[PDB]
């Protein structure tokens, strides 16, 4: 996260980090105690992934941490079925043992297709993660967060030569300087609705980070919520 602020412990209890041979390569969100949602381009790699929830400062072992092995990876079935790199950029992780929900480890809410999109069109979301705090710079130690406005489709499409699918949306600032970045991928874009946070996107991609005239690109979760509910349903 470029240009954000230090979060407080417990401020984003649905945020998890993905660790592999390299630590903290991506982010994710707690769906329930056995399931994480993230971006497919983070996890369709064959890397053996450990998930850590309740995390705040990734340099120190903190007593709130809960570490779990990933036992299954489900990229959305359309992700591997196409050449385009970021269309359908979403994936589910099943965990070896259930999380223990508490103040630092809490799921994110997920509305149905209609209402996830309504909340998104409120136009203000939060992103968080431990990715780079400058384009090609150093990564964060303390969890970062950032309020980002929704960018309308016409503006988004005209900001890039690249194809922006209906399964993507834009968020960021006209003047630049504030954006998600490499390493934040798979983390949540959430909308607060009377103090209840709902998942509205997945951090997916962009052309560089925080460049003026460019915006961050997010997977549109509303298009996938019916799929999420089915795959993560507990018994």
């Amino acid at each position: 996260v470029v240009g954000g602020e230090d979060a407080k412990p417990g401020q984003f209890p649905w945020q998890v980090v993905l660790n592999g041979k390299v630590d903290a390569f991506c982010g994710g969100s707690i769906v329930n105690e056995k399931w994480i949602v993230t971006a497919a381009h983070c996890v369709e790699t064959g890397v053996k992934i450990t998930v850590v929830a309740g995390e705040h400062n990734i340099e120190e072992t903190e007593h709130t941490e809960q570490k779990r092995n990933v036992i299954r990876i489900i990229p959305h079935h359309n992700y591997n079925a196409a050449i385009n790199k970021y269309n359908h950029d979403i994936a589910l992780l099943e965990l070896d043992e259930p999380l223990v929900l508490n103040s630092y480890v809490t799921p994110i809410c997920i509305a149905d297709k209609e209402y996830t999109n309504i909340f998104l069109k409120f136009g203000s979301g939060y992103v968080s993660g431990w990715g780079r705090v400058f384009h090609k710079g150093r990564s964060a130690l303390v969890l970062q967060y950032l309020r980002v406005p929704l960018v309308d489709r016409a503006t988004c499409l005209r900001s890039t030569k690249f194809t922006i699918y209906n399964n993507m949306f834009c968020a960021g600032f006209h003047e630049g300087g504030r954006d998600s970045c490499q390493g934040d991928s798979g983390g949540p874009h959430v909308t607060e609705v009377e103090g209840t946070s709902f998942l509205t996107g997945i951090i997916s991609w962009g052309e560089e980070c925080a460049m003026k005239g460019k915006y961050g690109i997010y997977t549109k979760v509303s298009r996938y919520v019916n799929w999420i509910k089915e795959k993560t349903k507990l018994t």
Partner: antibody
Amino acid sequence: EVQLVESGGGLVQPGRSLRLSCAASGFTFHDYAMHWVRQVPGKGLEWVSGISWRGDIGGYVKSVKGRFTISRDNAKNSLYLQMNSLRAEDTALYYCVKSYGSGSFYNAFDSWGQGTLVTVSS
Amino acid sequence: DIQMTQSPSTLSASVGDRVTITCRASQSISSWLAWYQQKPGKAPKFLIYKASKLERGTPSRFSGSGDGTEFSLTISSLQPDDFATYYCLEYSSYIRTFGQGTKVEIKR
């Protein structure tokens, strides 16, 4: 210097065909969507067709797609228009045009060629 | 399909005058409006994009304003080399409807 050099136009009998070419330089060709805009007697300008940097996005004005085909070859920095079964009202000056800024297919145009003149006549 | 109606269609004015050309869109196009200048025997020249931002190398006497359905191109202090036809272009739609053009003649 941005250059857009169109060729392949000229006089053609009704029902026959032409291939317009536009060879580009002075910018990174594959960073931009490219387009054909024609100026028809009266001096109205009219976007005819366009194509995204990668060739997977594009479109056509009404009443041409059955006869007209846009394409691009990024290795030769060229844009093309296949024109079949030509009719008298196709007569116009055909400009090769480049999207401004992001190179988005949906942007307006900042650079224009000199145009190739297409005449359909007996 | 969006209509662009430019007026007046012909204009005559003296050096140093202020001239305003308007462009009306049949439905709202936000600020996705460009202005072109076409001098005789030359290709159109990009002047203004996003309704009010100037391309590099277009003099500061050219000014654009407006949004939605009503737009204007303004020439602050008109010069003899400003003889041209000016066209607006909406690029809210992919069809890219051009205005009819305004021919500006210079009085002397």
